[PDB]
Structure formats: structure tokens, C-alpha cells
Design a protein around this ligand. Structure first.
Ligand SMILES: OC[C@H]1O[C@@H](O)[C@H](O)[C@@H](O)[C@@H]1O
Ligand SMILES: OC[C@H]1O[C@@H](O)[C@H](O)[C@@H](O)[C@@H]1O
Ligand SMILES: [Ca+2]
Ligand SMILES: [Ca+2]
Ligand SMILES: [Ca+2]
Ligand SMILES: [Ca+2]
Ligand SMILES: [Ca+2]
Ligand SMILES: [Ca+2]
Lengths: 374, 374
């Protein structure tokens, strides 16, 4: 079952199949840890696309059923096969490009892994289908929009030497981060004509502490030990993603509530989104604020250290979820900056630009559709 | 004052100046945090070079006097200007490539920074002189030796799926680390024909703790607080380089001695090299061993997390100092592996290759001489 807008649109598209140019269109997929989205774009649609379906899926067998279903649906409306496909997924891709491993899907290896050869040929031509990482897809989307001087349509400066200027990327490196089901991290590279994308897995590196004289030192130690207990039985130091994610905000929230002996089962049951919204009212939901503060504090800490290690010129906070959290970010700007410049080498990152996405736009789908064209 | 071997060699070289091909030679420089080395290679010397001078220097004004001096000395023996130069230095390089900032030199900005335009024209042709980072130079050296199938002449596998094979680099990413005056880190990249080098500053990122149930958790906290006290007055979390370096091994050693109330001023005064040598006798110098253990433990911890974040296929422990520490590494292999695979995502790094440099060879100079040729 497809929507009216999609149905009417595909009817307009298919008249071109009996034209000289034919109907050449491409498939793009954003496989997130919680939701998957699929979109189509014709050869001439250069900055736009048609989202045909989204689904809540946390294993690959359910994706296969979604792909089969939506493939048959588009086939009944277009007739003509897709000319190329790219799936940007929230995990790692095998050296041969054949297999995606979705890091935060649940179950055994079969339910976390997705092979190209399992995909329906209609939407996923066997020789013209590629896997990329989701943040790798974000970078191609960003690079594509930077090339057509359009990044200012969905990004805004939060600080840095370029913050009075319209958003545009210089030929240096830029770090891209996205907070969602997981912590996504990639880098736009300018080494040696264009931007090269490097996919990364830095959301899973062990966290760093604060200085022993920091006022948050005792309480951060308790939070890290609490999370390390619940996830790893204290055997490992937690990953940044164990805090900087949806479930991470939820578990930090439960820690804030345990230290305050707040037994209220209603405030106890909120999901990441309600905690995050509640946090924009500092005086009326102080516990949501405290958890969100620590959530974004650790996002600033991993971003700080990657800026130093990668020697980037700027960084971009991306994702549609980030749009809803920019208000919290501005309400707590000093607290975030205090964290970001808390480093012996703070002089090195004083001139780092920070951009944040301000309008909902699925940069992953744009990136996947850029790759799918070849 | 140049040596006999260098003097005799340059006399042999200069006969070619009155030949059809002329005398085209290139300058390479390895500017370390403690020592600087300079070398020459002719156009046809593809895997060899002539080291003409090394000096102990910890500020750039002393380097300028060394460069001026050795430039005039080579000029009096060769007559003909150098055709190209590259300086691989232990720090950052400005966007315009004009200025090197040596991270661990002492003094004000003038004594830590070195401009191209301050270099003698004879050895450093104004339009044909380039700055690279020292580990960036290491990678070009490694890549150069991999291209001529020669890495097995100075690297040996310590573990991984390729450890029965002769050392050769696949077309994937490789992390390169070197422990010396500082912690040097760069990455050989295979994105998209060849290896691309990415320079990095990851030695300066904040450390990670162990899991709260680890037997070393209480004592690591004391060590981190001790170093954070002495370097930063507890205001910052220490950098990996604050432990994984010469001065880091020395300060860890002093901490081991303080916790044992060892007042002996003779054992108290050892420099990094004597501590490291003493450490290869576990039963006779147990304190040196304990400090060296923690030294290499934190090297394994930063390497573990960078392998995860960068998704490399292998890593190389490089530098001439590493040669003298491989014995310690093999005596304490289980302790190092216990640290390296201590991660929730340990399955991801199970198949990572580890190589370590086994013969002294200045890979920085090879790399700089590769760049100097254009
Ligand atoms: O989706 C955000 C990120 O989530 C992480 O848990 C995955 O390992 C990454 O591959 C992904 O980019
Ligand atoms: O020499 C090893 C490393 O030392 C560090 O302190 C510097 O910041 C790096 O640029 C250098 O590569
Ligand atoms: Ca077909
Ligand atoms: Ca640049
Ligand atoms: Ca327990
Ligand atoms: Ca000249
Ligand atoms: Ca490859
Ligand atoms: Ca103090």
C-alpha cells in the first residue's frame, strides 16, 4: 500500500519509458538502527527525490520482507527496473561490498546482516547495487549540497571564525557527527579536486574522563560505573555511544532518577524523545535537563578529541533528530563550550567551526542517491 | 665539521656536475622533539641516502644555526645547489605550508615555530621545499618500501591473520604509531591506485579508563590523577602522550617509586632509555617493569580505539626506538593482548594485523626524500 502522492507521482514518471531517453531512475535506502527509508530519483532529479516508504525494522529479515513488498509495489506502478541502487546502512560493510552488518539490530548474525544477493532485482540491480555506511552517505549528501552552494538551506553556524558567513565548506577536513539510534561519525577529507569520504566507527571508542579537579568528576565516575555495570557488568569502559544515543539518553536519565530516589513510574518510563523535549524546560523537568546535559557533554567530548586527532577545520552536527535538539543546545551553550574547550591543547581548536542541521532533510538518502548514479 | 665517510662520498658525487645529467640531489630532514637529522640522496638513489648530520635541538633558533652551518659545509663540498627539499617535523604545519610548529620544543612561539623562508637557499630551494609531519613522513617511507616489496627487511609480524606471511601491505587502511619524544600517529589510507597518507595528532587526545571491575582500576586512577596533578594541576584529563612517550615513561616511573617510598636517588634519576632497558629484567628491576608495563598498556589502549574508529586492517609500530623495545613487548605479550582486546567490540579487532619495526632505519628520512623529489 503506497500513498496517494507517491502513486500519482510514479504515474507521471512512467510516460517517459516510451520516450527516446527512456525512464532511468535510481533507488536510495537509509537503513537506520530503528527505521529504514527508501526513495527514488530519476536521472534528471539532481537535488530532489521521492520517498516511497519508511518502516520500523530492527532485523534484516524484516527488511527483506519490506524490500520485497515495496519492490513489487513500485514494479506494478513503473514497470521498468531501476538502473542503480545504493543502501546506506548503520553499520559495517565487508571488504567485498556484499554484506552489511547493522550494528544495533537485535538477534543472531543472520538477523543483523544483509547480503546484496537477498535484495529484489527490480529495485537492486545485481551489478549496480552498492552498500555504504549511513554517515558515509551523510557526507556525500553534504558534499553534494556544498557543490551546489545549498548547505545554508539546512545548516547554521553555532560558532567559529566562519559563523557570520553563509554556510560553505572550505577545502580542508570536516568532521560529521549524527546522534540517533547510534553515534555516527565520518569525515570529509581534503588530501593530495573534490571531497573524499572516510567512513568511521568512532562512536564505539571508550570514553574519556574529566580532570580530577573538575566539579563533575565524582558524579561522572558514578554515571560511568552505573552504565558499565548495566551493560558490561563493570568489565569494560563504556563506549561514547552508550551515552550519546537514544538508549544512552534513556539510561543516563534512569541514573539521574536513581540518585534522586524518584520512584514515580510515569517520569520513569519516558523514551529518548520525551526526555529530550522535557529537557528544554530547565526549571520544570530538572532531571531530564541533567541527563540531556550529560548526553550532550559526552557528544562534545568525543567531538573535541576527534577535532584534535583528525585536525579538521570544522564539524557538522547532522540528522533530523539534531533539528529538534538545537534549542536545548543554545539554552546550554556555555556548558557545552566549557566541555569542548576543556583540553590542554585548547588553543588548537579555538578556531574550529561548528555547524548544526536546522531543517529536516534526509542527507543519507541524498548521499545514497548520489552513489547509486555511478 | 663533517665526517670522513660523508666527505669522501660527496667528492664522488660531484664529478657528475660536469656530466650531461648534471648533479641533481635532494635534501631530507627529520625534525624530532629532541633530535634533528639531515640527509641527502641523488636522483638515482631510490632506496638509499647519505646522512650528513644529526644534532640535539629543542628550539627552532638552534635548528636555523644547524641548518646554516651544515648548508655551508655541503656547499663547500658539492658547489651545486639542492634540487628539492622536504622537512618532516614533529608538529603541525600551517594551511599555507610555510610554517612548522614543533609541538614539544621549549620556549615562546618563535622558538617552537620554523618558517621555510628562514632556511638556507642552498639546501632548501624556495619554490621546491615542503613541510610534512614526521609520522606523515613515516607513512611515505613505509609506502615506498611496500611498493618495492622491502618492508620485510625491517618489519616483523607480532600477531594477526597475515603473521605467517612476509610483511606486505594490502589495499586497506593501516595505522602507524611511533613512540619517542612524543606519540606520533598517522594512517595509510586506501579509499576511492596507491596509498594516501593522512597526518594525525591522536597522541594528544584524552586517555580512556579501564572497566571498574578491572584489577588495575584503582591504581590506574591514582596514576592518572598523579600525572594530571603534576602537568595540569588536576584541571584536565591527561593526553595519551603524557604516558606514552619518553617523559611519560619517566613520570610513570616516578609514580611507581612514590607509591613504594623508594627514596634511592640513583634509581630515581634514570632517563627513559635506562628505565626501558632495565624493564627487560622483570625480577631484578621490578619498578622499571611496572612503569614500562603501564607505558605500553596505554599505547595498546589508544591503538585499540583507533583501530575501531578508523576501521584499519593492521597497524605498524615504527621508529628506531621501537627496535629496542620489541623484546620487552614479547616478554609481556599476554599483558599487552589483554589490554588490546579489552573492548565490547573485541570481535571487530580480532583479525587486525600488528607489525613492529625490527631493524633501525629512519623511515622519516626516506619519506621526506620521496616527497622532496616532487
Ligand atoms: O547510525 C549511526 C552509527 O551507529 C553505530 O552504532 C554504527 O556502528 C555506525 O556504523 C553508524 O554509522
Ligand atoms: O613526533 C611524534 C609526534 O609528537 C607529537 O607531540 C606531535 O604533536 C606530532 O605532530 C608528532 O608526530
Ligand atoms: Ca535486471
Ligand atoms: Ca587544504
Ligand atoms: Ca554486576
Ligand atoms: Ca637557487
Ligand atoms: Ca580496500
Ligand atoms: Ca595541585
Amino acid at each position: 500500500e503506497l500513498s496517494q502522492e507517491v502513486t500519482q507521482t510514479l504515474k507521471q514518471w512512467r510516460v517517459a519509458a516510451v520516450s527516446s531517453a527512456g525512464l532511468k531512475y535510481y533507488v536510495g535506502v537509509d537503513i537506520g538502527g530503528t527505521n529504514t527509508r527508501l526513495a527514488l530519483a530519476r536521472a534528471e532529479d539532481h537535488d530532489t527525490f521521492l520517498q516511497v516508504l519508511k518502516v520500523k525494522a530492527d532485523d534484516t529479515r524484516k527488511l527483506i520482507a519490506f524490500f520485497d513488498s515495496v519492490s513489487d509495489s513500485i514494479r506494478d506502478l513503473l514497470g521498468v527496473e531501476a538502473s542503480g541502487a545504493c543502501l546506506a546502512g548503520a553499520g559495517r560493510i565487508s571488504p567485498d561490498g556484499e554484506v552489511l552488518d547493522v550494528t544495533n539490530f537485535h538477534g543472531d548474525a543472520t538477523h543483523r546482516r544483509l547480503k546484496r544477493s537477498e535484495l529484489p532485482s527490480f529495485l537492486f540491480p545485481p551489478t549496480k547495487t552498492h552498500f555504504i555506511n549511513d554517515l558515509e552517505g551523510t557526507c556525500y549528501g553534504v558534499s553534494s549540497m556544498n557543490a551546489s552552494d545549498a548547505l545554508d538551506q539546512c545548516f547554521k553556524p553555532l560558532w567559529g571564525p566562519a559563523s557570520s558567513d553563509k554556510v560553505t565548506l572550505q577545502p580542508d577536513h570536516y568532521l560529521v557527527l549524527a546522534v540517533g539510534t547510534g553515534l555516527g561519525i565520518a569525515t570529509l577529507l581534503s588530501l593530495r579536486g573534490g571531497f573524499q569520504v572516510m567512513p568511521m566507527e568512532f562512536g564505539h571508542v571508550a570514553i574519556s574522563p574529566v580532570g580530577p579537579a573538575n566539579a563533575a568528576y565524582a558524579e561522572e565516575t558514578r554515571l560511568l560505573e552505573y552504565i558499565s555495570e548495566k551493560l558490561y557488568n563493570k568489565e569494560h569502559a563504556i563506549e561514547y555511544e552508550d551515552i550519546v544515543s537514544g538508549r544512552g539518553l534513556v539510561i543516563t536519565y534512569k541514573w539521574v532518577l536513581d540518585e534522586a530516589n524518584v520512584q514515580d513510574e510515569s517520569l520513569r518510563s519516558l523514551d529518548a524523545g520525551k526526555i529530550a523535549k522535557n529537557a528544554t524546560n530547565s526549571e520544570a523537568c530538572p532531571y531530564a535537563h541533567k541527563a540531556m546535559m550529560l548526553h550532550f557533554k559526552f557528544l562534545m567530548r568525543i567531538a573535541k578529541n576527534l577535532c584534535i586527532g583528525l585536525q579538521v577545520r570544522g564539524m557538522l552536527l547532522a540528522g533530523d533528530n539534531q533539528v529538534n535538539n538545537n534549542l536545548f543546545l543554545e539554552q546550554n551553550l556555555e556548558s557545552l563550550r566549557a566541555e569542548f574547550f576543556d583540553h590542554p591543547k585548547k588553543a588548537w581548536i579555538e578556531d574550529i567551526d561548528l555547524f548544526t542541521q536546522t531543517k529536516p532533510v534526509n542527507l543519507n538518502l541524498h548521499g545514497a542517491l548520489y552513489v547509486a548514479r555511478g
